[PDB]
Structure 1
Amino acid sequence: LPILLDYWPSMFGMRARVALREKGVEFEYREEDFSNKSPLLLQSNPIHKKIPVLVHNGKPVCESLNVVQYVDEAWPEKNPFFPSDPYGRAQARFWADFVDKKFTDAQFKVWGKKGEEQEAGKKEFIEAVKILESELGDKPYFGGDSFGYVDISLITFSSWFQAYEKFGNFSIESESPKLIAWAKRCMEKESVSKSLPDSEKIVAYAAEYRKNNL
C-alpha cells in the first residue's frame, strides 16, 4: 500500500492527500510529530526531513508538487490532471510554480508575521489572489477542463483562508471573490473533502505559532 508521511496542517501534505484520492487510490496516512521525524522518513529524506512523503515499491517520493506528479505517472489510465498538449502542461506547471513562490510566502507573511512584515504580506497575497482570479477567468478549473494538477496545488491553501482572514483582519473575498468562491466549489470532490482538516484547528495552529513567537 502507498505509504504517506503527513502533517495534519501541512498544506503540501494535503497536496499529496488531495492528489492520490482524486485519481482513485486507497492509501494510508501517517501523522508526524516533527519533533521525532520518522525512521522511515529520515531514511526517505535525511537532509530535508520534510513531508508529504509517498512510498511505493519500497521507494520514497518527496515534494508536494512532485508527489502529485508521481500520482499521475504511476497509474495513467483513469484520471489525468494534465491536458494532452505539452503547452497546457507548461501553463499548468507554470501556474504550479506561481503558488509556491510569492503566493506561499505571502500567506506565510499574513499569518506568520506582523507589522511592517504583515502589511507587506497582505498586499502580496491580495495581489496574487487578483492575478489568480484573472487567470481563472471563466474556467471551472485551472489545470484542465475538469480537475487539474494545479487545482490540487492551491486548493489546499483555502482552509488557511480563515486564518488569513482573522489575523489579517481582512476579507479576501470582497476584493477578489471568485478564487475563494472556486475553492469551496472544489471542496465537492471527495479527495479534498476527506483530506483537509478543519479550519478552526488550522486557525488555532496558526494562533499557536503566533502566541509563541511574539
Structure 2
Amino acid sequence: LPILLDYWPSMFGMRARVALREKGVEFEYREEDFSNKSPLLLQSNPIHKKIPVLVHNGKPVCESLNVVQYVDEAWPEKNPFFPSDPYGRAQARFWADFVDKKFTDAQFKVWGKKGEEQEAGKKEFIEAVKILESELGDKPYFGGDSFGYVDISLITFSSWFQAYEKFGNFSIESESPKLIAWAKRCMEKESVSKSLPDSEKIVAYAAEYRKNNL
C-alpha cells in the first residue's frame, strides 16, 4: 500500500489522511517520532524532513497540498477534488494557498503565543475566518455542491478549533457561524471523522506546548 509518514496532531498530515479516505484509497499510516525520524522519512524528504510524506510505488510525495493534489491525479476516476475548468481550479488553488498562509500564520499565534502577539494573532484569526465565511457564502462546501480541495485544506484545522477557543478565550461560532456549520457538516463524513483526532487530545497537545514554551 501507499505509505503515509505522518504525526497525529498535524493539521497538515491530516490533509493527506482525509484525501486518501475521500478517494477510498487504502494506505499504511506510520507515526513519525521527530526526535528520531525514520530512515524512510529522511531518505524521502531530505530537504525539509517534514511530514506528511506519501510514498507510492517507490516515489515520495512531499508537502501536504502537493500530496492532496497527487492523490487527486493518481486516483482520478472517482471523487474529483477539483472542478473541471481552469478558472475553478485556479480558485481552488488560491483559497488553499490562503489557508496555508494567512490562516495558518494566525492560528499558530493563537495557540502558540502569549501576550500582544497572541492578541494580534487572535485578531488576524478572526479576520481570516470572516474572509473564509464570505467565500463559503451559502454553499454547503468550499468546493460548492461537493466537498473538494479547499474543504480538505481547511477542515483538518477544525480539530484544533477547541484549542483555539480555549487559549484565545472566544467563540468561533460568534464570528463565523456558517463556517462552524460547515465544519459540523464535514464531520458527518467518515473520511473526515476517521482522520481527525479528538479535539480534547489536541487541546492537551497545545496545553503541553504552552507549558513547555511560554
Instruction: Sort the TM-score into its range (normalised by shorter chain).
Output: over 0.9
- The answer on whether the counterparts of 1:18 and 1:152 sit within 8 Å (CA) in structure 2 is yes
Secondary structure of 2:82's partner? coil
In structure 2, C-alpha distance between the alignment counterparts of 1:41 and 1:97, rounded to whole Å = 25
In structure 2, C-alpha distance between the alignment counterparts of 1:154 and 1:192, rounded to whole Å = 11
The Cα offsets for residues 9-66 of structure 1, whole Å up to 9 and x where unpaired, read as 0001000000011011011100111101110000001121100111111110000100
Deviation at residue 143 of structure 1 after TM alignment = 2.1
Identity of aligned residues (%): 100
The Cα offsets for residues 64-113 of structure 1, whole Å up to 9 and x where unpaired, read as 10010010000110110101111000000000010011100100000000
Q: Does 1:112 align with 2:106?
A: no
* Runs of 5+ unmatched residues, structure 2: none
In structure 2, C-alpha distance between the alignment counterparts of 1:51 and 1:63, rounded to whole Å = 7
The Cα offsets for residues 145-166 of structure 1, whole Å up to 9 and x where unpaired, read as 2011110000000010000000
Deviation at residue 144 of structure 1 after TM alignment = 4.0
Deviation at residue 176 of structure 1 after TM alignment = 1.4
- The answer on whether the counterparts of 1:82 and 1:144 sit within 8 Å (CA) in structure 2 is no
In structure 2, C-alpha distance between the alignment counterparts of 1:115 and 1:128, rounded to whole Å = 20
Normalised TM-score (structure 2): 0.98
- The answer on whether the counterparts of 1:6 and 1:31 sit within 8 Å (CA) in structure 2 is yes
Normalised TM-score (structure 1): 0.98
In structure 2, C-alpha distance between the alignment counterparts of 1:79 and 1:47, rounded to whole Å = 32
In structure 1, C-alpha distance between the alignment counterparts of 2:14 and 2:48, rounded to whole Å = 18
Count of aligned pairs: 214
Q: Does 1:19 align with 2:19?
A: yes
In structure 1, C-alpha distance between the alignment counterparts of 2:45 and 2:3, rounded to whole Å = 14
- The answer on whether the counterparts of 1:81 and 1:147 sit within 8 Å (CA) in structure 2 is yes
- The answer on whether the counterparts of 1:111 and 1:163 sit within 8 Å (CA) in structure 2 is yes
Secondary structure of 1:83's partner? coil
The Cα offsets for residues 153-195 of structure 1, whole Å up to 9 and x where unpaired, read as 0000001000000011111111211111101110111111111
Query: What is the aligned partner in structure 1 of residue 75 from structure 2?
Result: 75
Moved more, 2-11 or 137-146: 137-146
Secondary structure of 1:72's partner? helix
Q: Does 1:30 align with 2:30?
A: yes
* Runs of 5+ unmatched residues, structure 1: none
In structure 1, C-alpha distance between the alignment counterparts of 2:176 and 2:147, rounded to whole Å = 22
- The answer on whether the counterparts of 1:17 and 1:195 sit within 8 Å (CA) in structure 2 is yes
